Structure formats: C-alpha cells, structure tokens
Amino acid sequence: NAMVTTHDIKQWIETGLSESRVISAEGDGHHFEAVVLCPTFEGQTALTRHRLVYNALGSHMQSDIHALSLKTYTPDEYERG
Amino acid sequence: MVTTHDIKQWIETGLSESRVISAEGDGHHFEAVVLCPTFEGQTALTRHRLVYNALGSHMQSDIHALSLKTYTPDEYER
Ligand SMILES: [Co+2]
Ligand SMILES: [Co+2]
C-alpha cells in the first residue's frame, strides 16, 4: 500500500503471524504503534517478539511503513494485566 | 490526545457487559470491535446506535468520529 492505514497494519500482521491479534493499531500514515498478542511470544525475548512481527510484515515493513513502535504480549500477560 | 485505550475504557463503562476486543485510531478517526450478549436479536444498525448512546457526551468533542463492528460473543467465535 502506497498510503498505509491502521487497518493495513492490523490485517498484514494477522495474516503473516499465526494466532496473532492486533488489539490496538494507531498512527498517521508514517508513525504507528501496535499492541500485538501472540501465544508464540511465550519464552521469547522482547527483541525476538518484535522481530517476528517485523518479519511477518515482510516487504510492507521494508518499503511502506516508515516507523512502527510495538508492544508484544502473550494472551496470558495481557489477561493478567 | 484521545487514544484507543480511551475509546475502550469509555465504551466498557457506558455499555454494560460489553467488551472492546480491538480498536484502531488516528487521534480523530477511530474504529472499535465490540462484543456484547445484548446484541442478540438486534440489527447491526440498532447495535451501533446502542453503542453511540452508551458513549454519551464523549461524542460531542472527545471522539471526533467512530466506526463500529458489533458482535455477540458467540457470533465472533463463528
Ligand atoms: Co519520522
Ligand atoms: Co474527520
């Protein structure tokens, strides 16, 4: 997408990363924030959790999305919050 | 600055036994996915109106614009 929306960010991550839910996606076309839940993050460092997400966004991350800030939770970290 | 966290907090306070499972926003335009057992038997249009009313005076100026997807917990399970 030449002009990225928050609904893009949400669809692309859920498509690329199985069992993920983007519970919040915010931003203006250039700077975004996303809160991502995935049970696959269990036992993974914050850095790894973030990389799985950037990798799931594939070429969108490389070419379309200028900046993307993340909070990554397991479903359990989120419900126990 | 109004956030998707605000939207969720406000809908869940105002609309009883509802749950905002996801939300998007740019500061002015927002979307929320809302689950509530109440929505059973009600049309989409009715369910949207119920949520807008639940939000009360938040629509005046806090929330510039808001689209909705409204499901019963069950319909969401598929
Ligand atoms: Co910049
Ligand atoms: Co507007």
UniProtKB/TrEMBL annotation, chain B:
GO term, biological process aspect, one: DNA-templated transcription
One GO cellular component term noted in the UniProt record for this chain: cytosol
A Pfam family: BolA
InterPro entries xrefs: BolA (IPR002634), BolA-like_sf (IPR036065), BolA/IbaG_stress_morph_reg (IPR050961)
Family, per entry: Belongs to the BolA/IbaG family.
PANTHER family registered for this protein in UniProt: BOLA TRANSCRIPTION REGULATOR, BOLA-LIKE PROTEIN 1
Name of the protein in question: BolA
The species this protein was found in: Coxiella burnetii (strain RSA 493 / Nine Mile phase I)
Taxonomic lineage: Bacteria, Pseudomonadati, Pseudomonadota, Gammaproteobacteria, Legionellales
